[PDB]
RNA sequence: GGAUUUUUGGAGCAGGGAGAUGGAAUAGGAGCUUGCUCCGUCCACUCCACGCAUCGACCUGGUAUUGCAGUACCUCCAGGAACGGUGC
């Protein structure tokens, strides 16, 4: 097993992604595949020294992500 | 005629891209801009072509800009001998064509006669050679292109002129 | 699982750009499907014009993102 | 599948990732060391082969030069981490 | 799933390995997801190196570009489909 | 006749002649300059070939604009807030237009980005010292009547009319 | 499996293309031999090395691992991949 | 036509010689790894002996002994002895 | 159970449903991608309205010659050759009916009257 | 199917020195607000070593070509560096 499958427990889920180019974004992603592929939506994104740039349908990559933040009402053991 | 219009007689110390910007600004008016085929190699320097949406658009940019001042020398624009690769992949009603080729291809003759708002048909007199009679579904169109064709070049070895057919 | 097409270029001269901005001037001599092009008579070229003959460089495609040709082969 | 996940537990437990294995069976708050110099301190809730670890009570700190760098510090309790941005996963920090 | 397969054929700003945004009328995906961006351009920061000079972007167009899989940082939509 | 975002979205936003994003609306006689920003930050040229726009006005905030066709139009004057809505603007081609007097050159100078301009076929053309007024008011200009500007022309245009 | 990306690379090989690599090594020329691993062989190319002295070499072996992008035939816009 | 001389063939002949070479690195052409390789595997993750870091600009050499450098941060080597 | 209607609006029993073979559906592209159950039903539809409309808007009359041709490119190439044949077997006096001028050389009816009434013949 | 070509990453970072040179209205600390002193983020001018070279586009005037073809980019001399990344 992997925690890629734990991040596969995210759809209609309020998350926050700190990506590879100094990025930090709030996002309700669209759908995530086994290789971490989690496409953002209505997301407010800010790379290194940036603005709150908005993407209504965006496709955040895999290995070009760094950190993920799940919902607060998210049971961890039930999500993995 | 052609929708591909030749635009030349300008300076060479001007750039291809810069003269392209000038030509776009000055061509979106008299026609449409589809593509500017510009080569600044030596075999064709100081010249380019703009491929306009309509053949009458290109020849009308040619007849209005018949020597319009620009870029070091008054630029001259005419129709081309043929058309560009984009468009390649894509007073009366009746008038006698005098100096009508016994050699012309009816296809190009049709594109000539239908430069105007669509012509009715062209009838290259097949008896005693060197005559034709062309009718246009729009008589104003016939007279327009026939007056602008008085002395018109097609196969430049002659001038193909069409006047109002007599009584 | 497909070997690379250095086939007519083998035993011929290439001037390669590998990481560190470096250059390896040499003969195409040996490779694997890993593209590890190995250059004998290969010499380094640094940032400065200094160049040292390395004997036989087995230069991994791990870094070398370029290499140009000296002839037609 | 079955014997594979058996060997997988044995691998995460009696191999190199024993630090995170003890963070999971002992509920330790462990220092995941990024390759990008952002120190996150917290537990390990989900962990596997590639160093993919989900950390609870996560607190991220950076050396932020506005000067002499300050410790930019925040604490998002639950948050996941993939093992690519990680350089290390250390069981025990002195704090 | 193939999430982008709905949002393709429109002018989409694909993000770079170095932080550019390139609005190409995206075509298709892969397992590596290497991009084939048609009618595609690029634009990146023209860094003033200063503050009394301001930051802009000079326009570059490749047309149709085959962006190797190591490229994407994101893919958002910046133009509806023409 | 209503010129809407129907004719602005259905407009063609694609590769121009000089390989830039152009949005043509040829064949409408549109006299209404409204509902345009729905080009959605993916456009630099706004073209209204075959238009009857009562004057030069009515554009939205376009910090990107790189060409505009307002030729074959009914341009009589020139509106004010043009620069902050076209800072990237160099090509505002308004030939075959009907500008008349140099008071229609009042907002013409406030742009820092104007270099490729055309107001041809206007009664402001054959007037004496008209290109002089232009070469005075347009500092950063490079393409004027499709032939370069001149430092001699700039000397004349600054020195005269003190 | 097999990539319509690779079909695009095959339709972009053989003629003038313009690859762009990692550190700015951009080679505009005949991208002769590209294998689906993208190690592109270019021929009679003009490559900048991002150096602005974008000089013309012959038969370069520009890997595709560093390839940021690759400007392909503008005539195959109607590809069989997208159609 | 002509047969392949593997890079593993190079590394194997070098190790059989027990020879001292300096090796190149990644994203920093200033430093070189001066030492001898002891053994190998199918992976080409270079293992080394009595190695030292040698700097171009600084001009120093910091020795490790029997060190195990990364496999992906290798580029090539020059046999110095 | 999807059981088709009877006059008294109930399910049709199963052996009878099998006999009538409703399971089989016919993709009629002319009819707005309408799709039909029941084979003779399908067939009569070719003269039913939806097919008639389809035809009119296709630009080709609802004559029998195309009935059971349901794809529209086939229909247009069919009616294409049909058009060619109708124009063939028409006797058109313009190109057929032919006139000698006085000068011992011949033209058609059309050209004869043309140059006749534009002042020579 | 996280090991030398693409998706489990080599990413992060910092702008060379100084002059009784200066701006922080609404924003820094202490000397317990104002006045004034020193202190840990930039730009404008000037001194070095216009941070150093290449090339490309352009502005300047002179200067060669009148020519048909689908473009990385096509004159030559000379100035200036308004702009880009490549080696330190």
Swiss-Prot record, chain A:
The entry's keywords: Cytoplasm, Isopeptide bond, Methylation, mRNA processing, mRNA splicing, Nucleus, Repeat, Ribonucleoprotein, Spliceosome, Ubl conjugation
Sequence segments annotated as region (Sufficient for interaction with CLNS1A): 1-80
GO biological process: 7-methylguanosine cap hypermethylation; mRNA splicing, via spliceosome; RNA splicing; spliceosomal complex assembly; spliceosomal snRNP assembly; U2-type prespliceosome assembly
PTM comment text: Methylated on arginine residues by PRMT5 and PRMT7; probable asymmetric dimethylation which is required for assembly and biogenesis of snRNPs.
Ubl conjugation keyword on record: yes
Disulfide bond positions: none
Effect of residue 58 to K: Loss of interaction with CLNS1A
GO molecular function: RNA binding; U1 snRNP binding
Sm domain sequence ranges: 2-74
Gene Ontology terms: cellular component: catalytic step 2 spliceosome; commitment complex; cytosol; methylosome; nucleoplasm; nucleus; pICln-Sm protein complex; precatalytic spliceosome
Subcellular location: Cytoplasm, Cytosol; Nucleus
Top-level taxon of the source organism: Eukaryota
Keyword Secreted tagged: no
Membership in a protein family: Belongs to the snRNP core protein family.
More about this protein: In the autoimmune disease systemic lupus erythematosus, antinuclear antibodies are developed with Sm specificity.
Annotated protein name in UniProt: Small nuclear ribonucleoprotein Sm D1
Organism: Homo sapiens
Segment of the intact protein contained: 1 to 80 of 119
UniProtKB/Swiss-Prot annotation, chain C:
GO biological process, alphabetically ordered: 7-methylguanosine cap hypermethylation; mRNA splicing, via spliceosome; RNA splicing; spliceosomal complex assembly; spliceosomal snRNP assembly; U2-type prespliceosome assembly
Matches recorded under Pfam families: LSM
A GO molecular-function annotation: RNA binding
Transmembrane domains' residue ranges: none
Ubl conjugation found in the keyword field: no
Domain of life: Eukaryota
Domain Sm: residue ranges: 1-73
SMART domains to which the protein is assigned, alphabetical: Sm
Localization: Cytoplasm, Cytosol; Nucleus
Keyword Protein biosynthesis: no
Keywords: Cytoplasm, mRNA processing, mRNA splicing, Nucleus, Ribonucleoprotein, RNA-binding, Spliceosome
SUPFAM superfamilies hit by this protein: Sm-like ribonucleoproteins
GO CC annotations, alphabetized: catalytic step 2 spliceosome; cytosol; methylosome; nucleoplasm; nucleus; P granule; precatalytic spliceosome; small nuclear ribonucleoprotein complex
UniProt similarity note: Belongs to the snRNP Sm proteins family.
Role description: Plays a role in pre-mRNA splicing as a core component of the spliceosomal U1, U2, U4 and U5 small nuclear ribonucleoproteins (snRNPs), the building blocks of the spliceosome. Component of both the pre-catalytic spliceosome B complex and activated spliceosome C complexes. As a component of the minor spliceosome, involved in the splicing of U12-type introns in pre-mRNAs. As part of the U7 snRNP it is involved in histone 3'-end processing.
Protein name: Small nuclear ribonucleoprotein G
Organism from which the protein derives: Homo sapiens (Human)
Gene label: SNRPG
From Swiss-Prot, chain D:
Annotated GO CC locations: catalytic step 2 spliceosome; cytosol; extracellular exosome; methylosome; nucleoplasm; nucleus; pICln-Sm protein complex; precatalytic spliceosome
Region of interest called Disordered, as start-end residue ranges on this chain: 1-19
GO terms of molecular function: RNA binding
Residue stretches making up the Sm domain: 17-95
Keyword set, alphabetical order: Acetylation, Cytoplasm, Isopeptide bond, mRNA processing, mRNA splicing, Nucleus, Phosphoprotein, Ribonucleoprotein, Spliceosome, Ubl conjugation
Compartments reported by the entry: Cytoplasm, Cytosol; Nucleus
Gene3D superfamilies according to UniProt: 2.30.30.100
Kinase found in the keyword field: no
Keyword 4Fe-4S belongs to the record: no
Free-text function comment from the UniProt entry: Plays a role in pre-mRNA splicing as a core component of the spliceosomal U1, U2, U4 and U5 small nuclear ribonucleoproteins (snRNPs), the building blocks of the spliceosome. Component of both the pre-catalytic spliceosome B complex and activated spliceosome C complexes. As a component of the minor spliceosome, involved in the splicing of U12-type introns in pre-mRNAs.
Protein name, as recorded: Small nuclear ribonucleoprotein Sm D2
Species of the source: Homo sapiens
UniProtKB/Swiss-Prot annotation, chain F:
Gene Ontology MF: a single term: RNA binding
Statement: the UniProt record of this protein carries the keyword Nucleus: yes
Result when mutating residue 147 to R: Results in defective spliceosome assembly
Main location: nucleus
LRR repeats: 19-40, 42-63, 64-85, 88-109
An example Gene Ontology biological process: mRNA splicing, via spliceosome
Similarity annotation: Belongs to the U2 small nuclear ribonucleoprotein A family.
Quaternary structure annotation from Swiss-Prot or TrEMBL: Identified in the spliceosome B complex. Identified in the spliceosome C complex. Found in a pre-mRNA splicing complex with SFRS4, SFRS5, SNRNP70, SNRPA1, SRRM1 and SRRM2. Found in a pre-mRNA exonic splicing enhancer (ESE) complex with SNRNP70, SNRPA1, SRRM1 and TRA2B. Contributes to the binding of stem loop IV of U2 snRNA with SNRPB2.
Protein known as: U2 small nuclear ribonucleoprotein A'
Full-sequence range covered: 2 to 163 of 255
